[PDB]
Design a protein around this nucleic acid. Structure first.
Ligand code: MG
Ligand code: MG
Ligand code: MG
Ligand code: MG
Ligand code: MN
Length: 292
DNA sequence: GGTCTAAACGTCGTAT
DNA sequence: AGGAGCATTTG
DNA sequence: CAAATGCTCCTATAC
DNA sequence: GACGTTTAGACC
């Protein structure tokens, strides 16, 4: 069963990397090797997420050693990647990374990089890309101005599957058991839904809430969590949403278990000892407690 | 004051 | 998630 | 040859 | 990402 282009970019907003590697190479005429890359790497457990992305695009090399990756490094394969994101844009601050990457891509594809002028222009871009220029690259190209980075603002969720894609990456479905004397069982049971993202996209988080019509912002010193704790919102909004917009990967099974636990809470089995014991068993085979 | 939900407040460690 | 470079193939 | 791409190993904090 | 405890205060 094929994936949706929107869950792809959603997941890519969450997990993907756009990269430029600039390495010394005296064999080249500038003395420097310049290449672009696009990659997603994750736990071996989710090889099959990459496989469904590879089936979709018909491009990309998949590896599996200590982790599992899908990479696009040739021009032929990057054309496919750029055809994708021009048609289905990113909406996090990764958009800015992408626009820099795309800039550098054209330079390279057009061979404009085999040139002092090009090489320099490509560094301005690298300087503003993800982690910027390293201490040694800063030395090799002294006082090179970082290219202007688009501050990505006022973004509207383009498709509901974008959310399913993004929460497949940054989302979490867990059950919170709290030691509390004032409950007959001695514990509080709660269903929590969560999305996490660096504070630079707090704007985006704030209207995911508007999009879903539920949840609270939580700033932890920074990061931002979108947290839904309200049981009714989980019952009427979150579950039916993800029932329509499918999570991909192993998280699907955590979602199912979680969803099963919501029913139990809904039927109030969490207020009886047998209920609590049952939930604890499901919960312990869930997220961090699942296996091979 | 008993029982409970919501959510504020808190932290660990590795998948990404 | 993000990084860098040696190894090998290409034209 | 020199340029492109393959392959594989290093780093570390946003989730 | 996912696990844990404390606090505000609703409802009976
Ligand atoms: Mg991320
Ligand atoms: Mg994950
Ligand atoms: Mg990082
Ligand atoms: Mg993460
Ligand atoms: Mn992530």
């Amino acid at each position: 069963d094929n994936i949706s282009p929107w869950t792809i970019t959603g997941f890519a907003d969450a997990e993907s990397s756009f990269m430029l590697t600039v390495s010394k190479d005296s064999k080249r005429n500038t003395g420097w090797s310049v290449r672009p890359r696009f990659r997603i790497g994750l736990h071996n457990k989710d090889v099959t997420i990459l496989k469904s992305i590879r089936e979709y695009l018909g491009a990309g090399i998949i590896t599996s050693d200590i982790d599992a990756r899908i990479r696009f490094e040739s021009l032929k394969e990057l054309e496919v990647v750029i055809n994708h994101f021009d048609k289905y844009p990113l909406i996090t601050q990764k958009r800015a990374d992408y626009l820099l990457f795309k800039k550098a891509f054209y330079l390279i594809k057009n061979k404009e990089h085999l040139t002092e002028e090009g090489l320099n222009q490509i560094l301005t871009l690298k300087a503003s890309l993800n982690l910027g220029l390293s201490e040694e690259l800063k030395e090799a190209f002294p006082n090179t101005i970082p290219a202007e980075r688009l501050l990505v603002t006022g973004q509207e969720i383009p498709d509901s599957n974008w959310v399913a894609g993004f929460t497949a990456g940054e989302g979490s479905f867990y059950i919170r058991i709290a030691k509390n004397s004032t409950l007959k069982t001695g514990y509080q049971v709660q269903s929590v839904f969560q999305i996490t993202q660096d504070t630079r996209d707090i704007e985006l988080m704030k209207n995911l809430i508007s999009y879903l019509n539920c949840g609270n912002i939580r700033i932890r010193k920074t990061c931002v969590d979108l947290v839904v704790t309200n049981l009714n919102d989980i019952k009427e909004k979150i579950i039916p949403f993800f029932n329509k917009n499918h999570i991909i990967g192993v998280k699907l099974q955590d979602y199912r278990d979680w969803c099963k636990v919501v029913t139990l809470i809904d039927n109030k089995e969490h207020l009886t000892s047998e209920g609590l014991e049952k939930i604890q068993k499901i919960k312990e085979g869930m997220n961090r407690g699942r296996s091979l």
